[PDB]
Design an enzyme around this catalytic site. Structure first.
Site: not given
Lengths: 244, 241, 231, 243, 196, 204, 226, 250, 195
Positions: E1-2, E129
């Site tokens: 996830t970003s 992350s």
């Protein structure tokens, strides 16, 4: 606040009598008569229905004779709604006793518990007591055949034949006259109907106005057979005794 | 006879404490109307500020219960605030348990059951209000459900509440026997605000300033109230015709 | 009447009889008088006894090292409100390391009496208090009423025939408030103040009870042979 | 009848007699008013001096809630001090849960629901006060008045207590002469004048004036007690009008 | 996830990936991460999907109630609700939430709540992350008061990198534009940004 | 410790042509030492048969549990409970204690009166319904029966042929297991009557 | 265990395999995994067999009640939102993995829902043990604008791939097609892939093989009059 | 506070009546007439929807309800008191008998649970008995079709046909003449419309009469066709159009 | 642990339990009976965890005796076993279990038949012609198989029982210091004084 509206039902009157108990009894003399005659080898339960019409379903009906477990039945006199709560804690208590000892509960214990529950409702809580009287008709191995009655007081006693409901004075007078101790189940069948023909409000006794039940040692082995008569068997027993 | 001081069946079968509650409602001399359009619901309500000290805008009787159910109340205003706070909580709670927006039916049936509980217990007085929920439902289109201090509720083609309701009721009956439909036909919702106001003027016999009305329109997607200028615009368009 | 059953009921004019009756209970009690200057505060108390063999009842309760009250009326209720003030004086000294201000103690009693006459099944308290004390901002003297009202005064009396001493103190107001730095003369102004209310029962050396707290004086009680100086 | 013996029992009239008797307990109390200024609010209270024994200006009957709401009540001082005390918990748990000082229109509903609850059940007394509260928030000034029914509204000016018939009329003069808005400094002068005129019913016992105000321009949105030179300047304007 | 959210001249823009990985296997490759919790106060989830979704339900419930009693919530407020659940239950729920929102008074605002439960007002924020890999790129290139056309390109470049280096991100990039005009959704397929 | 291998036992049930059979071994161990051979696993309420394997103390608790619920049932509705219903009841009673389960594996067998359709059902610890038209097995040697039964079984056996099959199935698996043996009991259920046969098997 | 859900233009089809296992032993060769929350919301369960059977009934009750109380078709989003809440309150001990598909007035939906409570929307999801073999097959041939025919053929093919390549899968293919405005079509045992060939040599014993000690008759009736 | 509403409001009176319950039955005699006839292959239950205004729509309001897929109800008396009972009954069929047996209760068992809610309303403290009598029609496989009447005391009896409400006296005597045991479902319906036409003064057409049968099974509402072990509702409510058709064939 | 033996002859139950009690590395006391009489015809011996024994024996003995006063009717030994099994089953699910194994020996005066019951600490009841718990059943079960007959009288059974303990003396690796023997039969409950 709500101090005004209290009926304060549970206090004594100046005479030493509980008002709510004395009334409940009067209420119970309006419910249809129920009669129990105990003989040497069984018990008869005959109760006179209340409410009847050519348009009432009668065959499936059941309004005064309830089964508790295998070997114990009762007859209700009074509010049939009130009683239906006391019949459900009787069943539960019975099987709970079978779950803990592996024995069919003695008749003395299953009576003593429903009287404590009645007593405990006049002791505290400010609730009006149940309007019910029971005829516990039951059989254990300890004493053989037993009869018991209880009253909205709680007090209970054992009888060889007893009446509750309407004309208990009139019905108890006939029963003392004709009872005997060598009786058998088939003589008692005859007496229980003979008392109900004389006390009946009806112009004539009829099969569709009766709930009838026997508990006989009779039936295979030593085991006891409880038999709530079909509506059809009652028509046969009523021609057999020749009242019709 | 303690049957006129708590809710127990009278010797006659009545519940005197409830029959009393209805006559407590009709006392504000506010007359409310709710009629349905083709795709909206209009509700117009009399506003009466008594003294020049009270601020005009804070006085109000239309509440926004959710995003699509407005509720116009008729009665004393503290009980209304009580009924409004509780209804808002249920329209939130609904969307949280079931994940869609509380239809109007469902809210009206929830308040009804909540009203009943107070006429069954001996330790609460019934609410003294008549609640009229108005919405553009998702499924059933325009809706009105009017609820009472007994617990009774029922659907409505159009309703009127207040002391002088008899004038408005019989005026609405005449219009729907003429047109032979269940709802004001006119297509835009401004024409249905016009229609509502014209039947109020006739019924009560008196004309309106812009400070005497408070108006609420439910279209699909939003419920809103109209400002003093948007009311002034309707009033001038009725005087033209 | 009819409305004096419970305290849930306003009467048809607005009065609360159950609260005006609780007020009566203080007029049965004994007189006690309280006055104060800027340096010290003083309670002069008439102790009452039953028959001869009886001993006198204590009218002065020590609440802390800097605060105490006297009672007039129901002695069982005084011991229930002074127990509740004791817990508050500790609760302040442990959690904020702070001698509890007298102005606050008054507003706490105010709040506790109110919840007790609104509840169905409570009873109003039937006792009056003069609460004296010395905190950061100086000396105070409070009068507590069972209504709830806490009032801050220079002097006051409560009890039987209080009116005699209440008057005396409003004439002498300018003189006994300027007695600063002399604890001995403030007690003498108060003994005189209680002799206006006395009709019979001359003061004795076992009859009188004096408390004095101040800037340089932890809360002390004089009983018995320690009040031979001030008669 | 008998519909009055207990609370929350309807009568045939619809009236709730217990609440009607409560309004008579308010009318017995002392007088208070509130002016809604152009940018703030001013509060004024008549504190009867019962004796010369009472210490001057230590029995202040104006109470603050949070740090931007002034409350002042008439009727029974205990009933009110318990309503205010409870209001402080509602406001502190709003600032705890949303971390913004509570809007004044919201704080009004929370106090109403708590009063109103005391006419549902039939075992707690109605409240015997009328509260006039308000202050400044993000929208601006609000002034509210609360009755023992649970009924509150916004007001350009409000007054309760014994002298309220007098003061409602006098307030009204100041709203007709200034639709522009009576400015905050001007309203401290006028408040004292109104209290001095409405004190002509109670002119038996001397009284003490106490003013407080919450104003956007003056104290930056806080609540303070008008004091010293400015309270003294007002008291002088008031003595000059009655004589 | 970003995920990231970036204030600018006319409001605020949120950017996010859409890959959701459980181990090495990609469970769902088109997961909306930008969720509406009011009409102009959005948020982005990252961390344990089960835990953020729970916190977003209870926020969306608190705020619908708050609007019907007190009027429009500011963005500050919606931030403090998120905070209050993260911090009381920090023992179990493992949530990292960015709350971006637009009023008409104060234009765009961004709050970030890391895993502890600590609001922080910032001019941009990043979490997830794959955030670590673009801390440098974001800090040099950010400029206050960009043009809407210039910002989009500045978020598109960042997440292009955050996808290329991290194995736990990838797929379509979504963007949600919060302005006075309303809400506009944007979408960028992998051939529009991997070619760049 | 394995909460099921303390006592062991195996139960097997088969359908046939208008009849069912449910049979088991009679051992009761405490691991190595054998305690008793009188212990029966099969109980009957009305005309429905329930075999229960596993932790011996929960066999006794769960037999007196279900005798309670069905007696109450028989007094209200005034008829023995049917096998189709009774299977929901076993399942719901188990899952009621989801956490810290009864360590058992009940098996239902009987003939539904209204329709005449024979009916069998199986369970596991928590309580899922294993529905089969063939045969249900249960216990510690449940791996051995599954392979045994599948080879023998032919759909539709007459009541006296069914009695041979379910014997070979149970006898062989017991002497290939280290927790079963010491006789076996086999019930043959037909609508009219029930016939119970004790088996002579090896005492090793 | 293998479960696919394939949306299409006119509705949504949800297909499963019929093999239920308990360990390395095949307990049941037909036990269907397709359950019925309400008449147009179907779901299927992977993971612990007792959690998916029990937790569909605890939501079945509450969704049927709620359906009579509004007087409305009960939306899919209702069950999805009520399932999520029950599973999160036990902190993911309940190991239940469902595909909840169905139709209502608003249109077709299709969700997956994981033990802890995370949900996913999709156009085609698979869940289970051989769910990976299924996922591949979908990613190859799925396009938009599938007709009712193509989708069924697609879904059943994915379940087949699970059968040939996974061990835990096996047995038969079940389907259930829900279209918009029509009754759901349950196609129990839609495809037979493999039948059991007949035994090489029948096995059936003479009578009197078994050795017997006793015989008794068990009483199953109320004793009667004599 | 100390709420002291524990003492029941119902007390035995010196005459052996339960005061509150008697009065309740007055208000049940003021409710609108409703009747039910039990035949060989069904029951029918019907009533008049009293529409208080022409603006009101009594379509949205219902006096006949689904309790399970095979047990309907109709009522006489207080509207509110009815609606909250139907919601306790729908709930308690599920929580206390459907989860834990997997089957909808048999008709005579649900009535027993509903007779237990009346009892608790008149025994426990601070409540007043309900102001309604229910007729509960239903079908279960072992007892066949059955019809039940429930009172606000708690007592329930099974009836061959019956009426309660305003014109209950005139309705019960007209049912005894026209009733016999051979009645099919079609004939009993026609005897139900005649009996309601006596007691209804105003409108009498399909928009203002509510009529619902427990009868043969339906596989058209089943909704998930393609499974032989299910059979679907036995309850079906006749719509407005159906009811006007049995008035042409009057 | 400690040895308890039970053998049911033709007209009595015989219960035999060890004297010795081992707290600490010392044998502390070696005369202490390990058995409570429930009622005039039921004897219950017990062995297991330290101190739990005494508490779970006096507890049961109180309910049985509250039941004899209430009805004036001695509960059958069949009943008394299912009541001890009920308690032990409740204890295993509780916060802390009761690890107590019991042999209930009782002469039913209803049928004139003696009965022996074994309930172990999990809570399994089984009727047995002879039983034991612990490691005693490992030495004696193979000797009782060979000698026991159902028609033995009391005088014969005691000579079998003298042999069983003599088997334990050789192979057991723990002092128990001989047993106390008690007989339950129609005449009451008596103590065999000798070995």
């Amino acid at each position: 606040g709500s101090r005004r509206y209290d009926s304060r039902t549970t206090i004594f009157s100046p005479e030493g009598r509980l008002y709510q108990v004395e009334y409940a009894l009067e209420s119970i003399s309006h419910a249809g008569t129920a009669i129990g005659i105990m003989a040497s080898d069984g018990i008869v339960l005959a109760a006179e229905r209340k409410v009847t019409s050519t348009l009432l379903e009668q065959d499936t009906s059941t309004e005064k004779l309830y089964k508790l477990n295998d070997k114990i039945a009762v007859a209700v006199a009074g509010l049939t709604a009130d009683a239906e709560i006391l019949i459900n804690t009787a069943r539960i208590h019975a099987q709970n006793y079978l779950k803990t000892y592996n024995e069919d509960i003695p008749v003395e214990i299953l009576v003593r518990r429903l009287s404590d529950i009645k007593q405990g409702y006049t002791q505290h809580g400010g609730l009006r007591p149940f309007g019910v009287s029971f005829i516990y008709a039951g059989y254990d191995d300890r004493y053989g055949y037993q009869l018991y009655t209880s009253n909205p007081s709680g007090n209970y006693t054992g009888w060889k034949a007893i009446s509750v409901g309407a004309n208990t004075s009139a019905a108890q007078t006939l029963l003392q006259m004709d009872y005997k101790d060598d009786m058998k189940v088939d003589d008692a069948i005859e007496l229980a109907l003979k008392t109900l023909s004389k006390t009946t409000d009806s112009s004539a006794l009829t099969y569709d106005r009766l709930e009838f039940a026997t508990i006989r040692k009779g039936a295979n082995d030593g085991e006891v057979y409880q038999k709530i008569f079909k509506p059809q068997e009652i028509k046969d027993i009523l021609v057999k005794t020749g009242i019709t | 006879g303690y049957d006129r001081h708590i809710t127990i069946f009278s010797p006659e079968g009545r519940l005197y404490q409830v029959e009393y509650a209805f006559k407590a409602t009709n006392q504000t001399n506010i007359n409310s109307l709710a009629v349905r359009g083709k795709d909206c619901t209009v509700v117009i309500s009399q506003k009466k500020v008594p003294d020049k000290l009270l601020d005009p805008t804070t006085v109000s009787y239309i509440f926004c219960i959710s995003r699509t159910i407005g509720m116009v109340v008729n009665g004393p205003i503290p009980d209304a605030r009580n009924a409004a706070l509780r209804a808002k909580a249920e329209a939130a709670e609904f969307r949280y348990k079931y994940g869609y927006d509380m239809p109007c039916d469902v809210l009206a049936k929830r308040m009804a059951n909540l009203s009943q509980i107070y006429t069954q217990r001996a330790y609460m007085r019934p609410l003294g209000v008549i609640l009229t929920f108005v919405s553009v439902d998702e499924e059933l289109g325009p809706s009105i459900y009017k609820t009472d201090p007994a617990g009774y509720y029922v659907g409505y083609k159009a309703t009127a509440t207040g002391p002088k309701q008899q004038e408005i009721t019989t005026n609405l009956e005449n219009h729907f026997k003429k047109s032979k439909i269940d709802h004001i036909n006119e297509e835009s919702w401004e024409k249905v605000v016009e229609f509502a106001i014209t039947h109020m003027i006739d019924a009560l016999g008196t004309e309106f300033s812009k400070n005497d009305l408070e108006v609420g329109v439910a279209t699909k997607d939003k419920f809103f109230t109209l400002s003093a200028e948007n009311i002034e615009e309707r009033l001038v368009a009725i005087a033209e015709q | 009447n009819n409305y004096d059953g419970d305290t849930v009921t306003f009467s048809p004019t607005g009065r609360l009889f159950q609260v005006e009756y609780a007020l009566e209970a203080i007029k049965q009690g004994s007189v006690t008088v309280g006055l104060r200057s800027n340096t010290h505060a003083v309670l002069v108390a008439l102790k009452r006894n039953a028959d001869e063999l009886s001993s006198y009842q204590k009218k002065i309760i020590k609440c802390d090292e800097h605060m105490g009250l006297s009672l007039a009326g129901l002695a069982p209720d005084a011991r229930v409100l002074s127990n509740y003030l004791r817990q508050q004086c500790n609760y302040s000294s442990l959690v904020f390391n702070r001698k509890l201000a007298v102005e606050r103690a008054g507003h706490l009693l105010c709040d506790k009496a109110q919840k007790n006459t609104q509840s169905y099944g409570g009873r109003p308290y039937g006792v009056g208090l003069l609460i004296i004390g010395y905190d950061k901002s100086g000396a105070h003297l409070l009068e507590f009423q069972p209504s709830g009202n806490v009032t801050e005064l220079y002097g006051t009396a409560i009890g039987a025939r209080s009116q005699g001493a209440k008057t005396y103190l409003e004439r002498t107001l300018d003189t006994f408030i300027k007695i600063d730095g002399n604890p001995d003369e403030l007690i003498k102004a108060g003994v005189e103040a209680i002799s206006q209310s006395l009709r019979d029962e001359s003061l004795t050396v076992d009859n009188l009870s004096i408390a004095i707290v101040g800037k340089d004086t932890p809360f002390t009680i004089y009983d018995g042979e320690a009040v031979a100086k001030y008669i | 009848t008998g519909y009055d013996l207990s609370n929350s029992v309807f009568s045939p009239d619809g009236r709730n007699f217990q609440v009607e008797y409560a309004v008579k307990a308010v009318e017995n109390g002392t007088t208070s008013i509130g002016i809604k200024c152009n940018d703030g609010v001013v509060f004024a209270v008549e504190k009867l001096i019962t004796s010369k024994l009472l210490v001057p200006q230590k029995n202040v009957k104006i109470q603050v809630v949070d740090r931007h709401i002034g409350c002042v009540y008439s009727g029974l001082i205990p009933d009110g001090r318990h309503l205010v005390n409870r209001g402080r918990e509602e406001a502190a748990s709003f600032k705890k849960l949303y971390k913004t000082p509570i809007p004044i229109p919201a704080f009004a509903d929370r106090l109403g629901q708590y009063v109103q609850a005391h006419t549902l059940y039939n075992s707690v007394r109605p409240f015997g006060v009328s509260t006039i509260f308000g202050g400044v928030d993000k929208n601006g000034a609000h002034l509210y008045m609360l009755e023992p029914s649970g009924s509150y509204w916004g007001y350009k000016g409000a007054a309760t207590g014994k002298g309220r018939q007098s003061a409602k009329a006098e307030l009204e003069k100041l709203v007709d002469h200034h639709p522009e808005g009576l400015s905050a400094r001007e309203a401290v002068k006028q408040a004292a004048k109104i209290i001095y005129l409405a004190h002509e019913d109670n002119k038996e016992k001397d009284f003490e004036l106490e003013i407080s105000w919450c104003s956007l321009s003056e104290t930056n949105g806080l609540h303070k007690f008008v004091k010293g030179d400015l309270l003294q300047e007002a008291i002088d304007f008031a003595q000059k009008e009655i004589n | 996830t970003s995920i990231m959210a970036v204030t600018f001249k006319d409001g605020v823009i949120l950017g996010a990936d859409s890959r959701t990985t459980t181990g090495a296997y990609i469970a769902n490759r088109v997961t909306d991460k930008l969720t509406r919790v009011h009409d102009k106060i959005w948020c982005c989830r990252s961390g344990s999907a089960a835990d953020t979704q729970a916190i977003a339900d209870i926020v969306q419930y608190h705020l619908e109630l708050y609007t019907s009693q007190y009027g429009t919530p500011s963005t500050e407020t919606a931030a403090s609700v998120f905070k209050e659940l993260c911090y009381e239950n920090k023992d179990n729920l493992t949530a990292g939430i960015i709350v971006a929102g637009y009023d008409d008074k104060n234009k765009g605002e961004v709050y970030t709540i890391p895993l502890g439960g600590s609001v922080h007002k910032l001019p941009y924020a990043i979490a997830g992350s794959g955030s670590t890999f673009i801390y440098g790129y974001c800090d040099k290139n950010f400029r206050e008061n960009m043009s809407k056309e210039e910002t989009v390109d500045f978020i598109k470049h960042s997440l292009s990198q955050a996808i290329k280096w991290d194995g736990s991100s990838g797929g379509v990039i979504r963007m949600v534009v919060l302005t006075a005009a309303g809400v506009e959704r944007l979408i960028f397929y992998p051939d529009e940004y991997e070619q760049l | 410790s394995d909460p099921s291998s303390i006592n062991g036992g195996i139960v097997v049930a088969m359908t046939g042509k208008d009849c069912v059979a449910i049979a088991c071994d009679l051992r009761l161990g405490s691991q190595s030492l054998g305690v008793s051979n009188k212990f029966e696993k099969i109980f009957h309420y009305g005309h429905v048969f329930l075999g229960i394997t596993g932790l011996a103390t929960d066999v006794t608790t769960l037999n007196e549990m279900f005798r309670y619920k069905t007696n109450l049932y028989k007094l209200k509705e005034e008829r023995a409970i049917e096998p189709e219903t009774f299977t929901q009841l076993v399942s719901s009673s188990l899952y009621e204690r989801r956490f810290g389960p009864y360590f058992v594996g009940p098996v239902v067998a009987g003939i539904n009166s209204k329709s005449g359709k024979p009916f069998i059902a199986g369970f596991d610890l928590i309580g899922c319904i294993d529905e089969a038209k063939d045969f249900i097995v249960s216990g510690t040697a449940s791996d051995q029966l599954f392979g045994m039964c599948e080879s023998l079984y032919e759909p539709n056996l007459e009541p006296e042929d069914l009695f041979e099959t379910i014997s070979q199935a149970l006898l062989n698996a017991a002497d290939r297991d280290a927790l079963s043996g010491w006789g076996a009991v086999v019930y043959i259920i037909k609508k009219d009557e029930v016939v119970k046969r004790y088996l002579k098997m090896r005492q090793d | 265990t293998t479960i696919v859900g394939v949306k299409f233009n006119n509705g949504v089809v949800i297909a499963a395999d019929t093999r239920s296992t308990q360990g390395p032993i095949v307990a049941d060769k037909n036990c269907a995994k397709l359950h019925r929350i309400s008449p147009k919301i179907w779901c299927a369960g992977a993971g612990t067999a007792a959690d998916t059977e029990a937790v569909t009934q605890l939501i079945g009750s509450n969704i049927e009640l709620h359906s009579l109380y509004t007087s409305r078709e009960p939306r899919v989003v209702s069950a999805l939102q009520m399932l999520k809440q029950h599973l999160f309150k036990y902190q993911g001990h309940i190991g239940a993995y469902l595909i909840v598909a169905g139709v209502d007035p608003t249109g077709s939906h299709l969700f997956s829902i994981h033990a802890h409570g995370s949900t996913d929307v999709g156009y085609y999801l698979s869940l289970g043990s051989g769910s990976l073999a299924a996922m591949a097959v979908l990613e190859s041939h799925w396009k938009q604008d599938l007709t009712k025919e193509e989708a069924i053929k697609l879904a059943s093919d994915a379940i087949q791939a699970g059968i040939w390549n996974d061990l835990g899968s096996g047995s038969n293919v079940d389907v259930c097609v829900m279209e918009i405005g029509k009754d759901a079509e349950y196609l129990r045992n839609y495809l037979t892939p493999n039948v059991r060939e007949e035994k090489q040599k029948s096995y059936k014993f003479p009578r009197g093989t078994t050795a017997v000690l006793k015989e008794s008759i068990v009483n199953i009736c109320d004793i009667q009059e004599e | 506070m100390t709420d002291r509403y524990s003492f029941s409001l119902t007390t035995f009176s010196p005459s052996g009546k339960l005061g509150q319950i008697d009065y309740a039955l007055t208000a049940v005699k003021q409710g609108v007439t409703s009747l039910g006839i039990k035949a060989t292959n069904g029951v029918v239950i019907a009533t008049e929807k009293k529409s208080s205004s022409p603006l009101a729509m009594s379509e949205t309001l219902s006096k006949v309800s689904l309790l399970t897929p095979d047990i309907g109800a109709v009522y006489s008396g207080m509207g509110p008191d009815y609606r909250v009972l139907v919601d306790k009954s729908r709930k308690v069929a599920h929580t206390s008998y459907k989860r834990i047996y997997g089957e909808y209760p048999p008709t005579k068992l649900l009535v027993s649970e509903v007779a237990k809610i009346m009892q608790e309303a008149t025994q426990s403290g601070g409540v007043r008995p309900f102001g309604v009598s229910l007729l509960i029609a239903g079908h279960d496989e072992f007892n066949g079709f059955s019809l039940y009447q429930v009172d606000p005391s708690g007592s329930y009896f099974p009836w061959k046909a019956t009426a309660i409400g305003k014109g209950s006296v005139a309705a019960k005597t007209f049912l005894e003449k026209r009733w016999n045991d051979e009645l099919e479902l079609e004939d009993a319906i026609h005897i139900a419309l005649l009996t309601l036409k006596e007691s209804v003064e105003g409108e009498f057409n399909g928009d203002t009469i509510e009529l619902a049968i427990i009868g043969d099974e339906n596989p058209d509402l089943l909704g998930y066709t393609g499974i032989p072990t299910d059979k679907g509702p036995r309850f079906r409510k006749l719509t407005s159009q159906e009811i006007n058709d049995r008035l042409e064939a009057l | 642990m400690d040895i308890i033996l039970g053998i049911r002859v033709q007209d009595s139950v015989i219960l035999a339990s060890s004297k010795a009690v081992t707290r600490g590395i010392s044998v502390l006391k070696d005369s202490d009976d390990k058995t409570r009489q429930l009622s005039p015809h039921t004897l219950m011996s017990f062995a297991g965890e330290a101190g739990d024994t005494v508490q779970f024996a006096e507890y049961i003995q109180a309910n049985i005796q509250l039941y004899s006063i209430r009805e004036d009717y001695e509960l059958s030994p069949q009943a008394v076993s299912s009541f001890v099994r009920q308690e032990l089953a409740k204890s295993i699910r509780s916060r802390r279990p009761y690890q107590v194994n019991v042999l209930i020996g009782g002469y039913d005066k209803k049928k004139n038949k003696p009965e022996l019951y074994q309930i172990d600490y999990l809570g399994t009841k089984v009727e047995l012609p002879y039983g034991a718990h612990g490691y005693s059943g490992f030495y004696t079960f193979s000797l009782l198989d060979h000698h026991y007959r159902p028609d033995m009288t009391t005088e014969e059974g005691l000579d079998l029982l003298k042999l069983c303990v003599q088997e334990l003396e050789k192979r057991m690796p723990m002092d128990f210091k001989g047993v106390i023997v008690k007989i339950v039969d129609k005449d009451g409950i008596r103590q065999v004084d000798d070995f």
